[PDB]
Design a protein around this ligand. Structure first.
Ligand code: ZN
Lengths: 49, 11
């Protein structure tokens, strides 16, 4: 299985999402992240493997 | 939303 990421439409950072989060809104922002660690646009983008 | 998929070695 691969890692899904979504891009914040405000800050353009990519955020990892839980597997099987298969339905998203049209626009998505860091503030909507289920993970509170990455729920602010100021938090750096996680690296790729 | 804009999404992408990346390799994840652990899985
Ligand atoms: Zn953001």
């Amino acid at each position: 299985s691969d890692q899904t990421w979504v891009q914040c439409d405000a800050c353009l950072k990519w955020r990892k999402l839980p597997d099987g989060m298969d339905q998203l809104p049209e626009k998505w922002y860091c503030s909507n992240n289920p993970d509170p660690q990455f729920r602010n646009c100021e938090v750096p983008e996680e690296p790729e493997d | 939303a804009r999404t992408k998929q990346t390799a994840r070695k652990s899985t």
